From a paper:
[name], a VRC01-class broadly neutralizing antibody (bNAb) against [name]-1 [name] with relatively few somatic hypermutations (SHMs), represents a promising target for vaccine strategies to elicit [name]-binding site (CD4bs) bNAbs. The VRC01-class of bNAbs targets a particularly challenging epitope to elicit bNAbs against due to the presence of the CD4bs N-glycans that sterically obstruct interactions between [name] and Ab CDRs26. The glycan at position N276gp120 is highly conserved and poses the greatest steric barrier to binding VRC01-class bNAb iGLs, as Ab residues in the iGL CDRL1 that interact with this region are typically 11–12 residues and cannot accommodate the N276gp120 glycan. Mature CD4bs Abs develop shortened or flexible CDRL1s to accommodate this glycan.
To gain insight into [name] CDRL1-iGL interactions with [name] containing an N276gp120 glycan, we solved a single-particle cryo-EM structure of BG24LC-iGL bound to [name] containing the restored N276gp120 PNGS (GT1N276gp120). We identified three unique 3D volumes containing either one, two, or three bound BG24LC-iGL Fabs, with the highest resolution complex (4.2 Å) being C3 symmetric with three bound BG24LC-iGL Fabs. Electron density in the Fab CDRL1 was not optimal after cryo-EM processing; therefore, side chains were not modeled. The BG24LC-iGL-GT1N276gp120 complex structure showed that the Fab CDRL1 main chain residues adopted a helix-like conformation to accommodate the N276gp120 glycan. Thus, after superimposing the gp120 residues in the BG24LC-iGL-GT1N276gp120 and BG24mat-[name] structures, it was evident that the N276gp120 glycan in [name] showed steric clashes with the CDRL1-iGL in BG24LC-iGL. Flexibility of the N276gp120 glycan on [name] may be more constrained than the counterpart glycan on [name], as [name] contains fewer N-glycans in the CD4bs, allowing for increased N276gp120 glycan flexibility. This assumption is consistent with the ELISA results showing that BG24LC-iGL bound to [name], but not to [name] [name] trimers with an N276gp120 glycan. BG24iGL constructs did not bind detectably to [name] with a PNGS at N276gp120; however, BG24mat and mature [name] constructs with iGL LC features (BG24CDRL1-iGL, BG24LC-iGL) showed comparable binding to each other on GT1N276gp120. We further investigated how the glycan landscape of an immunogen affects germline binding, finding that BG24iGL-LC can evade clashes with the N276gp120 glycan when the [name] HC includes bNAb features and the CD4bs epitope is only minimally glycosylated. Based on these observations, we propose that boosting immunogens might first aim to target mature HC features, and then introduce the N276gp120 glycan in a limited CD4bs glycan landscape before moving to a fully glycosylated [name] landscape.
Author numbering:
A (entry chain M): 1 to 82, 82A, 82B, 82C, 83 to 100, 100A, 100B, 100C, ...
B (entry chain P): 8 to 66, 66A, 66B, 66C, 67 to 95, 95A, 95B, 95C, ...
């Protein structure tokens, strides 16, 4: 069973970082590619990024590169750090995983395959509301 | 957010977002209000564990067919938000989940 607890701060301020956590106990060695998925009021599900064993966390271009990520095996968890927050970022931040599978449409030596991300196991998600007070 | 209406027992065939370009690996999700989204259709035909034979997408064989999601025999519990993450080959990477469609059940 993939356990995903969300010990988020909930009430954040402007010019402050994020501290939302998710710690996985179980079948979590390298294959389940973890990611972060949020849901705002009005704005849909924005896939803001993932992290693998290659240590290349590609971020969202609409996120404007204001998020650094941190996955460690010492504390055995995955954290998010969002800087310079806006009051439209009162979103529920789920910590889910994905399985990167390829779709071959031609010859594999000519680069005719593209990768998708199928989210199979999800979490709970904490309500991190941006407060400007 | 585009709404859609269906009754009890009718096969709800909801539409997709952007136009299909080449190969397709659609990712259909049922986002419950308040709860977590549930994976429904991956690789245009396959289903994960815990999903019956009612939820089924169109397999992309001999491209020219639009991607839809058939929900045969809907209930009151399966009335929530829906997403279609379109993954193709002629647009590169897909960063957004597309236009969300909202299914409504009369009754
Ligand atoms: C010269 O020699 C080359 C190799 O030596 C030949 O290259 C081969 O080219 C064919 C092209 O048709 C490739 O075959 C196809 O592979 C697709 C995916 O690969 C794998 O899929 C399955 C595993 O997931 C597996 O069962 C399969 O055997 C294969 O290993 C596969 O698929 C889709 O392909 C098209 C892409 O647009 C679609 O039009 C098609 O409808 C298929 O879509 C269906 O299947 C997918 C996945 O199952 C579903 O998600 C969809 O919903 C839908 O149902 C095909 O079935 C086919 O097997 C082959 O991989 C490749 N070989 C290599 C690189 O070694 C080359 O063709 C040859 N030239 C000539 C002229 O003979
Ligand atoms: C570039 O190529 C596209 C086709 O690959 C040309 O047509 C555009 O196609 C897209 C999707 O079919 C439409 O959304 C655009 O409106 C089309 N452009 C038009 C009608 O001007 C396109 O013309 C090509 N050239 C440029 C400069 O984009
Ligand atoms: C390729 O595209 C042309 C133009 O639309 C079409 O007439 C033809 O049938 C297509 N070939 C296929 C689907 O094999």
């Amino acid at each position: 069973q993939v356990q995903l607890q969300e010990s988020g701060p909930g009430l954040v301020k402007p010019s402050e970082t994020l501290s939302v956590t998710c710690s996985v106990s179980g079948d979590s060695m390298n294959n389940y590619y973890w990611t972060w998925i949020r849901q705002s009021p009005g704005k849909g599900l924005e896939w803001i990024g993932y992290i693998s064993d290659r240590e290349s966390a590609t971020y969202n271009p609409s996120l404007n590169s204001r998020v650094v990520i941190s996955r460690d095996t010492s504390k055995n968890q995955l954290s998010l750090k969002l800087n310079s927050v806006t009051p439209a970022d009162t979103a529920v931040y789920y910590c889910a995983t994905a399985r990167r599978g390829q779709r071959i449409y031609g010859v594999v030596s000519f680069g005719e395959f593209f990768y998708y991300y199928s989210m199979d196991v999800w979490g709970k998600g904490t309500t991190v509301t941006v407060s400007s007070a | 957010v585009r709404p859609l209406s269906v009754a009890l027992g009718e096969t709800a065939r909801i539409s997709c977002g952007r136009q299909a370009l080449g190969s397709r690996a659609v990712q259909w999700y049922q986002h419950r209000p308040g709860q977590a989204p549930i994976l429904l259709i991956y690789n245009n035909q396959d289903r994960p564990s815990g999903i019956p034979e009612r939820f089924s997408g169109t397999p992309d064989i001999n491209f020219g067919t639009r991607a839809t999601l058939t929900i045969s025999g809907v209930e009151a519990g399966d009335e929530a938000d829906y997403y279609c993450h379109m993954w193709d080959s002629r647009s590169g990477f897909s960063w957004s989940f597309g236009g969300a469609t909202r299914l409504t059940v009369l009754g």
